[PDB]
Structure formats: C-alpha cells, structure tokens
Ligand binder design. Structure first.
Ligand SMILES: CCCCCCCCCCCCCCCCC[C@@H](O)O[C@H](CO[C@H](O)CCCCCCCCCCCCCCC)COP(=O)(O)OCC[N+](C)(C)C
Ligand SMILES: CCCCCCCC/C=C\CCCCCCCC(=O)O[C@H](COC(=O)CCCCCCC/C=C/CCCCCCCC)COP(=O)(O)OCCN
Lengths: 83, 70
C-alpha cells in the first residue's frame, strides 16, 4: 500500500510519459469489458445490410417471416433511431 | 535306464514336429495372403488401407452468396 503509493509518486515525477502511457493502455484494455454500448456496436454492425436479403420460399408455416417489408414481423431498428 | 531317466518316446517328438509344421505352414500361407491383400489394396484403394485423405465436405458453405450463380 504505502510502498506502491510511494512508487507511483516517484514515477509520476521525472517520468510522466511512461505513467500516462501505461494508464491509457490499461484503461483501453479494461474499459471495453465494462462498457454496455459494445453490445450496441455489435448490434449496429449486424444490422447493417451489405448483401441483398434473399427471400424465403413460403410454405404456410413461417409465422415469424414477414410477407412485406411494412409487416410487423421481422427485426426492428427503432432502437437505432432512438440512439 | 538311460532311456527311462533322460529321454522320452518317439511319439512326443513326432507330434511336436507335426504341431510345429502346422503352425509354420499357416504362418506362411498368412504371409502370402497378406502380401496379396496389400498389393490389391494399394492398386485399387477400396479397402481400409491406403486411404489417403480428401477434402472434407462439411467445410462447404451452403448459403446465398450475394450472387445467384454462386
Ligand atoms: C555303471 C554306470 C555306467 C553308465 C554311466 C552313465 C553316466 C551318466 C552321467 C552323464 C549325464 C549327462 C547326460 C544328460 C545330462 C543332461 C540331460 C537332461 O535332459 O537330463 C536332466 C537330468 O540330468 C541330471 O539332472 C544332470 C546330470 C549330472 C549328474 C552327473 C554326475 C556327476 C556330476 C558332478 C557334480 C559335481 C559335484 C561336486 C564335486 C566336488 C533332466 O532331464 P529332463 O529334461 O527333465 O527329461 C524329461 C524326461 N523325463 C520326464 C523322463 C525325466
Ligand atoms: C498493462 C498495460 C500494458 C499496455 C500499456 C503500455 C503501452 C505502451 C507503453 C510502454 C512502452 C514501452 C515501455 C518500456 C518501459 C521501460 C522503462 C525503462 O526501462 O526506463 C527506465 C526508467 O523508467 C522507470 O522509471 C521505470 C518505469 C516507470 C514507471 C512505469 C509505470 C508503472 C505503472 C504506472 C501507471 C499505473 C496505473 C495508472 C495509475 C495512474 C492513475 C490513473 C530507464 O530510463 P532511461 O531512459 O534509460 O534513463 C536513464 C538515464 N537517466
């Protein structure tokens, strides 16, 4: 405790560059595992349509698949609009 | 006395020789059969031996590929 604090105080003097670099690197490593918006970023990446959405062959047993784009069935991007 | 104390009868050696001959004959025919089986398997490749690997078909992606003609 005291030794660690003394070492940090000594490093903060005459060596600020290394302390700042290590602090920034440690924060960059640690914080993403705690930030809740990384899931939002993953969802935004997954919600980006790059290819043409190929339609499925309807057989009368697809309740979750919409028949038209304006139909309520299917994923919604209202959360992205609200961001 | 010498025959009774130190040696046995002829039938012992006779039957031991017969057993040894049978064992060696089966071994020889098995060796010939193994050589022939190896030759046929390597020439054809329809047996469990000499099965060289091929590309696994589970790696193939069966999905739409941004282009109808694959
Ligand atoms: C008046 C006599 C005239 C004739 C004299 C004949 C002399 C004979 C002595 C020479 C013996 C050597 C011939 C055979 C020796 C080894 C053969 C071996 O197969 O026999 C073994 C037996 O042989 C004896 O154990 C060893 C012979 C040694 C005795 C010689 C006497 C002098 C030796 C000196 C020792 C030193 C002592 C210390 C000195 C200071 C076990 O037999 P086994 O494989 O089961 O047979 C199975 C069949 N059965 C079931 C019918 C039995
Ligand atoms: C865990 C995260 C890792 C990733 C982050 C790091 C990214 C890149 C930063 C490091 C780059 C390379 C660093 C190499 C370190 C070498 C140090 C060294 O040998 O220098 C010593 C001297 O350096 C030292 O004093 C030792 C290291 C200094 C302390 C290092 C920081 C330790 C931790 C501090 C931060 C702790 C966490 C943040 C708390 C701050 C509050 C938020 C000799 O100095 P000379 O240049 O030779 O001068 C001789 C002539 N006078």
């Amino acid at each position: 405790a005291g030794r660690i604090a003394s070492f940090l105080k000594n490093a903060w003097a005459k060596e600020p560059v290394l302390v700042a670099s290590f602090a920034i690197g440690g924060l960059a490593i640690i914080l993403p595992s705690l930030s809740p918006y990384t899931n939002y970023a993953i969802r935004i990446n997954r919600a980006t349509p790059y290819n043409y959405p190929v339609p499925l062959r309807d057989d009368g047993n697809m309740p979750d698949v919409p028949s038209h784009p304006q139909d309520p069935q299917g994923p919604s991007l209202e959360w992205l609009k609200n961001l | 006395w010498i025959a009774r104390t130190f040696y046995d009868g002829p039938e012992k050696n006779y039957e031991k020789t017969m057993a040894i001959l049978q064992i060696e004959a089966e071994k020889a025919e098995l060796r010939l059969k193994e050589l022939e089986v190896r030759r046929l398997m390597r020439a054809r490749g329809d047996g469990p031996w000499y099965q060289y690997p091929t590309i696994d078909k589970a790696l193939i992606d069966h999905s739409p590929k941004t282009t109808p003609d694959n």
